Amino acid sequence: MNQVSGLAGKESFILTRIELFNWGGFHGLHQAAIHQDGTAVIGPTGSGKTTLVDALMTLLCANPRYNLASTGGHESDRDLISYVRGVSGPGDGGEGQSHIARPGKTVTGIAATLEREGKQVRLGALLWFDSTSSSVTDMKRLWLFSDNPGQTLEHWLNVYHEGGTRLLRQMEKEAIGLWTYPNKKQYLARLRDFFEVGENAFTLLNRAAGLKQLNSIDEIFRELVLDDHSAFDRAAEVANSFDGLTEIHQ
Amino acid sequence: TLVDALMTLLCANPRYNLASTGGHESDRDLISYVRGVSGPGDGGEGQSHI
Amino acid sequence: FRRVEDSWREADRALRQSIIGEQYHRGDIVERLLNDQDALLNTPEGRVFDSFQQQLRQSSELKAMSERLRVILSHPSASDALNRLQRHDLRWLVKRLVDESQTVLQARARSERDVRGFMKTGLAAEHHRVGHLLNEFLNLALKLDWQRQMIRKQEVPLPAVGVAVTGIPAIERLRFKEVDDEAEQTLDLSNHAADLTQIGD
Amino acid sequence: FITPNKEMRLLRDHTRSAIVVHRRGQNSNMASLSWEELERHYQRRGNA
Amino acid sequence: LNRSSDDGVTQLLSHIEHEVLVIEERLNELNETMFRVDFQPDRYLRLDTK
Amino acid sequence: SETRTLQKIREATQELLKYGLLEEASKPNLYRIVLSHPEEVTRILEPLDLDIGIDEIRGLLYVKVRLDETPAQDEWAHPLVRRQRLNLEQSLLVAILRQHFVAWEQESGTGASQAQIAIDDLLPQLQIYLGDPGSESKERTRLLTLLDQLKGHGLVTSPDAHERIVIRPIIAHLADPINLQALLAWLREQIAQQT
Amino acid sequence: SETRTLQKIREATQELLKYGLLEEASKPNLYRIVLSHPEEVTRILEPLDLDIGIDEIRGLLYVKVRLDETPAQDEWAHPLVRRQRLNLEQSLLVAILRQHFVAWEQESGTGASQAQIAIDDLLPQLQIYLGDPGSESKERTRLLTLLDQLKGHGLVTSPDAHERIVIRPIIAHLADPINLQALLAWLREQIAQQT
Amino acid sequence: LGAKALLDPRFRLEFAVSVMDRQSGNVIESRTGSQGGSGGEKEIIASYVL
Ligand SMILES: Nc1ncnc2c1ncn2[C@@H]1O[C@H](COP(=O)(O)OP(=O)(O)O)[C@@H](O)[C@H]1O
Structure with missing residues (x-):
């Protein structure tokens, strides 16, 4: 049976271990491992599976469609804010349809651990609030990208307590094999350049989950696989110049 | 197919094969059941699909 | 194709320059555009493009x-x-090449739109006087060497209207910090794990 | 593969480990187990 | 007027179609990939376009 | 007893002072309060050597330096005004904006406020005068630097998502044809300086 | 139609508004003119909901808000007045200056001799809590930047030829220094603990 | 949807469901504050009402 995955290990990078802290309906630290031959995630509906799926998604895509699997067709009932604040919402279990476990000043982090043949490479983020204000700007941000075994959320939290973002940036400057970025755009470029793929693939992956909602092959090559090259704006534009020139004529 | 057959009797215009698209649209017609069509055959003149 | 774009941009620039001039008829404007169109069937670049x-x-x-x-x-x-x-x-x-040629057509467009900007709004009423004064000012401004920052910063005799008055330096406006608290949201790295004795049949 | 409880039988045939996710009020926990450990713990549940 | 507007209306309806002659080139790569895997014990898929 | 002015009058005058202009289309209540006691506004600005400008055709109210027994000399030396003095490039862009404003006015009338142009529309209009910096981003920086200040004077709105701006009606008076002729004479003096 | 406001009253009121606070020892003529026309000045300022506070003992005049008494904005806010909230170090230096000004007004009179202190005297007080920044040049730069910022706040003067500043009387006119007292108690407690 | 509301009777009004106490006849809750997971809990009330 091992031969079906004999390609693995050798060729591609792999996803093995997911560190979580104060994400979704989880508190403190939590860990999972993924065996080099695949794995299933199990538990009663309402436990965490969609939460974990989404929790990995942030690192790879710029537009997380949270909770797509049960909702493909309409907008997600959830967002980055709700998860980070630990809002149970309708899943309150009777707690005023809201329940909020981290409303005040709080810190949240995530870190996935890709690798190949022992070469660790870690994609991690940190999101935190200073007050009950829940503006988009209130959430201060910082990504991570490292291939040094000495870096982990389990470590980065200690420094974040030891000092502000200046201290983290100082660690980045002093240490080696570590980079940080306040903008996700440059970080996503830092991904694409490493993995030698455009900006398309790492999106389609985020619509793999929506397979439940297929009508026919006729869609898979009209909404997911093919990119967009439409020209409604251009086609509209030419009609103008024609009218202006007719105006000169008249 | 069995449920489709029964449904032809109770309904004014039953929507055959509905549960294949969640509630969106019907694919088959009535006649192909009588003709016993075994799906869409090959385009090389076919005739093996009926 | 970029060279042809350069010619059309330059023609647009010159046409606007001349429009700011007060001396052209409608015929002058509407004819100079045709003269341009026939101007770029001469050079090797224009020959190439119109041939394509x-x-x-x-x-x-x-x-x-x-x-x-x-x-x-x-x-x-x-x-x-x-x-x-x-x-x-x-x-x-x-x-x-097809998708590059799209750039040039627009690069000509601008001039194809400018002339319509002069046919309609024939100067009239107080608008005539205001526009003519503006045109005089603009034409005169050309004489200057605008490169010097200090010159561009030289103060003008325009009237101070719509004056913004605000920011009174009152003592009451001053307040000090109003908190001194401090505490840490300690790190709870307790290694949690699931408890398989808790879920049912 | 994610999947609800149903047809664990199939996934036991094409995997080497599984992750359980527990729900309890508003605290949710999870563990990574090989199939053999899960089988032993089921046997103990049978002993429970 | 004719020359300019006509060049425009042609530089569009070249561009629109010309894409199709790129989509019909990507599908070769998938038909290339799907030739390496047996869908059924001795069958393989392939993609075509009307 | 006390000379306390009516609270609504104080509100309207304080707002007008805070922003230096007041449009009925935006804040009709304060505008009508001002035009209900315009002599009060005058007699309050008069202590400050300031005066109220009024243009009801565009539904606009703005404050302007008054003439003291000395006509404020160079009125820009008035103690209260917080801003600097206008300069050449600002006047150039003001003239171009007023040109577009008068075109739009002939097109749709004077009282409305829907006029607009885009960043790329402005960029050639000034690039003709200012030379080419060498990159599009640099000329955009130039234009935005000018626009920030001109907004600081209330002439224009902030750059929108479409990279356009809305002309404020007050420009009708900064670009007064009498003031334009005076500025033309001043420009002739600048020519004499160049001479 | 009717008379204008007297020139000197207008000029003095505008001067004070520009400066916020002024001294007889600085401009005695305007000081006397305003104090001879307080009704006129307040009538000029009450439409703005502003007014003036004075201290003849220390010879200082200064502005003051005159809104309607105690609205819900007890932490008041006024249109024409943008308020400020100083930082840790700014208010720290303010507390230092307050304590030494309190001492001076006892050992040198309530403004009879303008409150003074040397740079080399303020610097040790800051060093009590902040410690040595790294060099004497750094100490002087820190204290001089802070003193300049407070001078922009109208609280202190620049050091004299002997590096001695003069404390403006306005320091005695702060609203609620109880916060300063609590802050200074906290600072002394912290340094006592952190030594 | 605006035209729908203007013309469709169905879009002129909105619907909701209350949990009723069989004993007192009182309402305890009007919202499914126990739903979540992969959305598999909403099916209860919907299926019951259907
Ligand atoms: N905004 C929300 N609304 C409802 N439930 C939420 C929300 N955010 C988080 N949750 C909770 O997080 C979990 C999401 O369900 P999950 O267990 O991830 O789904 P499944 O395992 O069925 O794929 C549930 O416990 C759900 O109640």
Whole structure:
């Protein structure tokens, strides 16, 4: 049976271990491992599976469609804010349809651990609030990208307590094999350049989950696989110049 | 197919094969059941699909 | 094609410059554009471009060129001749030229839209006087050497209207910090794990 | 593969480990187990 | 007027179509990939376009 | 007893002072309060050597330096005004904006406020005068630097998502044809300086 | 139609508004003119909901808000007045200056001799809590930047030829220094603990 | 949807469901504050009402 995955290990990078802290309906630290031959995630509906799926998604895509699997067709009932604040919402279990476990000043982090043949490479983020204000700007941000075994959320939290973002940036400057970025755009470029793929693939992956909602092959090559090259704006534009020139004529 | 057959009797215009698209649209017609069509055959003149 | 774009941008610039001039009839404006259109059927660049444009209407060669290029790139030794990106780009020559030509048409467009800007709003009423004064000012401004910052910063006699008055320096406006608390949201790295004795049948 | 409880039988045939996710009020926990450990713990549940 | 507007209306309806001759080139790669895997014990898929 | 002015009057005058102009289309209540006691506004600005400008055709109210027994000399030396003085490039862009404003006015009338142009529309209009910096981003920086200040004077809105701006009606008076002729004479003096 | 406001009253009121606070020892003529026309000045300022506070003992005049008494905005806010909230170090230096000004007004009179202190005297007080920044040049730069910022706040003067500043009387006119007292108690407690 | 509301009777009004106490006849809750997971809990009330 091992031969079906004999390609693995050798060729591609792999996803093995997911560190979580104060994400979704989880508190403190939590860990999972993924065996080099695949794995299933199990538990009663309402436990965490969609939460974990989404929790990995942030690192790879710029537009997380949270909770797509049960909702493909309409907008997600959830967002980055709700998860980070630990809002149970309708899943309150009777707690005023809201329940909020981290409303005040709080810190949240995530870190996935890709690798190949022992070469660790870690994609991690940190999101935190200073007050009950829940503006988009209130959430201060910082990504991570490292291939040094000495870096982990389990470590980065200690420094974040030891000092502000200046201290983290100082660690980045002093240490080696570590980079940080306040903008996700440059970080996503830092991904694409490493993995030698455009900006398309790492999106389609985020619509793999929506397979439940297929009508026919006729869609898979009209909404997911093919990119967009439409020209409604251009086609509209030419009609103008024609009218202006007719105006000169008249 | 069995449920489709029964449904032809109770309904004014039953929507055959509905549960294949969640509630969106019907694919088959009535006649192909009588003709016993075994799906869409090959385009090389076919005739093996009926 | 970029060179042709340069010519059309320059023509647009000159046409606007001249429009700011007060001396042209409507005929002058509407005729200079046709003179430009016939101006760019002379240079090698214009010859090239107008020759190409027809070669979409009568698509004789724009299959032959791609086809033969496909033939050449099918030869093995070509791999050594060109790096991979060169070959990929060359294989789609026709498309990239078609999509590049889109830039020039717009680069001519601007001038194709300017003249309509003069036919309609014939100067009249107080607008005539205001526009003529503005045109005089603009024309006179040309004489200056505008490169010097200090000159561009030189203060003008325009009247101070719509004056913004605010920001009174009152003592009451001053307040000090109003908190001194401090505490840490300690790190709870307790290694949690699931408890398999808790879920049912 | 994610999947609800149903047809664990199939996934036991094409995997080497599984992750359980527990729900309890508003605290949710999870563990990574090989199939053999899960089988032993089921046997103990049978002993429970 | 004719020359300019006509060049425009042609530089569009070349561009629109010309894309199709790129979509019909990507599908070769998938038909290339799907030739390496047996869908059924001695069958393989392939994609075509009307 | 006390000379306390009516609270609504104080509100309207304080707002007008805070922003230096007041449009009925935006804040009709304060505008009508001002035009209900315009002599009060005058007699309050008069202590400050300031005066109220009024243009009801565009539904606009703005404050302007008054003439003291000395006509404020160079009125820009008035103690209260917080801003600097206008300069050449600002006047150039003001003239171009007023040109577009008068065109739009002939097109749709004077009282409305829907006029607009885009960043790329402005960029050639000034690039003709200012030379080419060498990159599009640099000329955009130039234009935005000018626009920030001109907004600081209330002439224009902030750059929108479409990279356009809305002309404020007050420009009708900064670009007064009498003031334009005076500025033309001043420009002739600048020519004499160049001479 | 009717008379204008007297020139000197207008000029003095505008001067004070520009400066916020002024001294008889600085401009005695305007000081006397305003104090001879307080009704006129307040009538000029009450439409703005502003007014003036004075201290003849220390010879200082200054502005003051005159809104309607105690609205819900007890932490008041006024249109024409943008308020400020100083930082840790700014208010720290303010507390230092307050304590030494309190001492001076006892050992040198309530403004009879303008409150003074040397740079080399303020610097040790800051060093009590902040410690040595790294060099004497750094100490002087820190204290001088802070003193300049407070001078922009109208609280202190620049050091004299002997590096001695003069404390403006306005320091005695702060609203709620109880916060300063609590802050200074906290600072002394912290340094006592952190030594 | 605006035209729908203007013309469709169905879009002129909105619907909701209350949990009723069989004993007192009182309402305890009007919202499914116990739903979540992969959305598999909403099916209860919907299926019951259907
Ligand atoms: N905004 C929300 N609304 C409802 N439930 C939420 C929300 N955010 C988080 N949750 C909770 O997080 C979990 C999401 O369900 P999950 O267990 O991830 O789904 P499944 O395992 O069925 O794929 C549930 O416990 C759900 O109640």
